[PDB]
Design a protein around this ligand. Structure first.
Ligand code: HEM
Ligand code: HEM
Ligand SMILES: Cc1cc(N)nc(COCC[C@@H](CN)OCc2cc(C)cc(N)n2)c1
Ligand SMILES: Cc1cc(N)nc(COCC[C@@H](CN)OCc2cc(C)cc(N)n2)c1
Ligand SMILES: C[C@H](O)[C@H](O)[C@H]1CNc2nc(N)[nH]c(=O)c2N1
Ligand SMILES: C[C@H](O)[C@H](O)[C@H]1CNc2nc(N)[nH]c(=O)c2N1
Ligand SMILES: [Cl-]
Ligand SMILES: [Cl-]
Lengths: 362, 362
């Protein structure tokens, strides 16, 4: 069935990809080559053109993503040639550098060798290439709680965190054949961070908040025409709410809302005062102001929703079915102020796409 | 099939109702009486105990309702005895009066005679018993746009609105046998309205905003054990966001956000300033402050979510399956600050329940 699963996916993808690329007449001969290759080797190798468009199609099909308008401008880096951990490390270092682009972030994906027989060639342990460590000992809570399990795993491997609230986790990945992953400390010079300040409230800096510039998802599987690229980290720029309404606001994350209420000078005593709501808005104002001031790319949820409307419009104009997850597309701040809230979305899964996969630790 | 549909619903409801009421031993003899009654008349009549608990069960099963914690305290008014339009009118007048309770709102439902052969005995045209009219002529937009179609219908029937932004719509309903509905102007003395002011911004009153005290849904069908109570208006108290984040904020409603931004003294120029978000919070603060100050019952979305958590906890303790619609349960303001946002809900439909039905106009 496995060969058959692969062959059926390959047929569907190539025909669709080549159709969009206007290479319709070449589908026949390509499907032939692919078929013999699957017969012979048990798999097939994507052309760079197929891989590139396949990763763009995958982003376009990501139901939970509000930023899909710019799907076709994705910067695809083909690193199917890597064989050593030093090569993987430098590819990851390069991704961070080129995607960051001195603050003017380029949406980028680096694609490592795919699974062979379900056997991983490269196994990335990081959720994001840049993320803060998390600790808990005797109810002493430090850093990002979401990173607690990965941090413990890393500290098993000889790494030790400084135990600030913003320890940069090292890159950690495992190569095929090795029993343990290796880890590499990130060069600080490659990592842009943004101090959080408020446009008119000076005391906001007393909170000593900051966040990292680029969100680089590194734990998802890119599937393209039957081929499983388990290692393919990708990035865009942040939508402010991700930082100000979740990362810094969630009680199971940094949980900063009470401290925010204090610095903006309001009481945090009564539900009816809506102090959490007010704190959320000022914090999200702070995030947007700070990134813009530092010259780091970011988008507000209103502008992003406007862009997604254009994405919807582009889809219908192009005769493509639109899919989406309403529960993920609405922003956690003032969602009813966006058009997204006021319509429905088909949550059907279309391939190519990005998928969750089991974590190699915990 | 109709008799069979009815009989199967009746079996399921009576057994469940009597079980909860601890009248398990009486299910057998009741099911017998009901069965002969269906054979003879084509239908069966609920006891007051069955009707009362049936309407409470229906509220408990309303997947979209965040306020279900107080399901068992529902005030059920049995008006299956009405036969004249004057009786219907006075029953509706009474509902408003007793539910309002001088501001200390009582969750109440008034139950009119059920459909017979799918034939309505009483046909209520109002979406809510208390709602504001809406007009549009040559792009001259007045009042609540959501009420535009009902308003036009009423003005066909000899009624005329003053064309303020807050015209109280008359009660309008049709009796079985009559071709046209009748309409009755609401006595102002029965209708509590709340002027919208802000706790610390005096200029907020310049907006001249107000809203009505009690939300009384009057266009839904209550279904209890096969019996279709198409006419059964019900009320609770408002959650603030319903007024401040939707009714007064939506662009297709009162669309007051720009005017709010002006009175609270912020620019409405840039998306990145998050001015809509800030306006939304101050407006919702205003709503809660105003209702509390007037002595009119209201609940904030944080407290309501806390209560719904208790409802969830009560359900599991009682060995009942919990159902809910996540898309309706999250508040339109700071939803990620509630526990609801961070879990999933089974959106299965359980009867008894309240349902949408076709509007008799448009
Ligand atoms: C260009 C800037 C981008 C923005 C502003 C953006 C925005 C977002 C946001 C706000 C989410 C929801 C995450 C959350 O609620 O926590 C999301 C999810 C997602 N985005 Fe994007 N995105 C961008 C670029 C990309 C790119 C380049 C890809 C991949 C090629 C991508 C794929 C996804 C996927 C797969 C998810 C869902 C992740 C999951 O299921 O856990 N996005 N995006
Ligand atoms: C006691 C105070 C109550 C509060 C604060 C409350 C709160 C809410 C809220 C916020 C909604 C969502 C409406 C929207 O998003 O626009 C809702 C929906 C609903 N509530 Fe309640 N509710 C209350 C009482 C009741 C009562 C007494 C009933 C009936 C017995 C009821 C049945 C429903 C139903 C059926 C819906 C869904 C309406 C629809 O599908 O369009 N609720 N409730
Ligand atoms: C617990 C958890 C597990 C898991 N697999 N994923 C998540 C969160 O979902 C994906 C990460 C979210 C966090 N805001 O960011 C998505 C995203 C991706 C990209 C490429 C850009 C962007 N701005 N935002 C959380
Ligand atoms: C367009 C439309 C049609 C339709 N059938 N229903 C709606 C809105 O949903 C029901 C009304 C909503 C409006 N916030 O209020 C529900 C509600 C009911 C009750 C008993 C109490 C309460 N606080 N809130 C809108
Ligand atoms: C079309 C979309 O389902 C629509 O916005 C729904 C869902 N979310 C909602 N949530 C609430 N509380 N009230 C509503 O009227 C709606 N409308
Ligand atoms: C459990 C529930 O589905 C959960 O809150 C989901 C849905 N809504 C979300 N929406 C966004 N944007 N991001 C998230 O992580 C989630 N989490
Ligand atoms: Cl993040
Ligand atoms: Cl309403």
């Amino acid at each position: 069935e496995e060969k058959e699963i692969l062959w059926n996916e390959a047929k569907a993808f190539i025909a669709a990809c080549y159709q969009e690329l206007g290479k319709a007449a070449e589908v026949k001969d390509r499907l032939a080559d692919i078929k013999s290759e699957i017969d012979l080797t048990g798999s097939y190798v994507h052309t760079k053109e197929e891989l590139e468009h396949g990763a763009k199609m995958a982003w376009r099909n990501s139901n939970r993503c509000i930023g899909r308008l710019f799907w076709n401008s994705l910067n695809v880096i083909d690193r199917r040639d890597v064989r050593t951990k030093e090569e993987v490390r430098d590819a990851l270092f390069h991704h961070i550098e080129t995607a960051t682009n001195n603050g003017k972030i380029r949406p980028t994906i680096t694609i490592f060798p795919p699974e062979e027989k379900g056997e991983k060639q490269v196994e990335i342990w990081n959720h994001q290439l840049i993320r803060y460590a998390g600790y808990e000992s005797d109810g002493e809570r430090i850093g990002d709680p979401a990173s607690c399990s990965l941090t413990a795993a890393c500290e098993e491997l000889g790494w030790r965190g400084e135990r600030t609230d913003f320890d940069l986790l090292p890159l950690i990945f495992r190569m095929k054949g090795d029993e343990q992953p290796v880890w590499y400390e990130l060069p600080r010079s490659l990592v842009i961070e943004v101090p959080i300040t408020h446009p008119d409230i000076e005391a906001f800096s007393d909170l000593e908040l900051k966040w990292y510039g680029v969100p680089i998802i590194s734990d998802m599987k890119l599937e393209v025409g039957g081929i499983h690229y388990n290692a393919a980290p990708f990035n865009g720029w942040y939508m402010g709410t991700e930082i100000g309404a979740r990362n810094l606001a969630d009680e199971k994350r940094y949980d900063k809302l009470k401290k925010v209420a204090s610095v903006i000078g309001i009481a945090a005593d009564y539900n009816t005062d809506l102090w959490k709501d007010q704190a959320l808005v000022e914090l999200n104002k702070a995030v947007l102001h700070s990134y813009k001031k530092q010259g780091v790319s970011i988008v507000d949820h209103h502008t992003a929703a406007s862009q997604f409307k254009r994405f919807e419009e582009q889809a219908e104009e192009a005769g493509r079915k639109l899919t989406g997850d309403w529960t993920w597309l609405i922003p956690p701040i003032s969602p009813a102020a966006t058009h997204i809230f006021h319509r429905s979305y088909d949550n059907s899964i279309v391939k190519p796409n990005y998928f969750y996969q089991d974590k190699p630790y915990e």
